[PDB]
């Protein structure tokens, strides 16, 4: 009713973001997801330098999300894909279910008339390994 879910694991450090007017989610990814974030400058996860930044998710036209975590190829459990549907059917895939094993795929659905006002994001410096929508 408050939230959504956490998506992946929430054993590494929590940050928390709060979502602008422009109703943005940024993202940096690359075989994973290396961090999430409200605006271009306040990405949670690995450093700038880990991923590269992609186009933001409009959070007020998303849908649904469906989340990969597992055991990743190059080490540990992390979130290595996000697919973001929006509410005309169009999506977008972030990251990669290619580059681990074990998997779990989590779905989720926007509830109506909710506006997510922020996003905590569980990273360990390195990756992201969870994430959570509050309305």
Request: without cysteine; glycine residues 12%.
């Given at each position: 009713?408050?939230?959504?879910?956490?998506?992946?694991?929430?054993?590494?450090?929590?940050?928390?973001?709060?979502?602008?007017?422009?109703?943005?989610?940024?993202?940096?990814?690359?075989?994973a997801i290396d961090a999430?974030?409200?605006?271009?400058?306040?990405?949670?996860?690995?450093?700038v330098q880990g991923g590269?930044?992609?186009?933001?998710?409009?959070?007020?036209?998303?849908?649904?999300?469906?989340?990969?975590?597992?055991?990743?190829?190059?080490?540990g459990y992390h979130i290595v894909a996000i697919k973001f549907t929006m509410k005309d059917g169009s999506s977008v895939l972030l990251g990669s279910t290619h580059y681990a094993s074990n998997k779990k795929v989590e779905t989720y659905t926007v509830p109506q008339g909710k506006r997510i006002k922020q996003i905590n994001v569980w990273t360990g410096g390195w990756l992201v390994e969870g994430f959570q929508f509050v309305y």
């Open positions: 009713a408050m939230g959504s879910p956490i998506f992946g694991y929430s054993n590494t450090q929590q940050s928390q973001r709060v979502v602008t007017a422009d109703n943005l989610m940024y993202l940096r990814s690359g075989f999430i974030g409200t605006t271009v400058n306040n990405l949670v996860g690995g450093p590269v930044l992609r186009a933001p998710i409009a959070l007020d036209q998303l849908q649904s999300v469906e989340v990969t975590s597992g055991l990743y190829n190059w080490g």
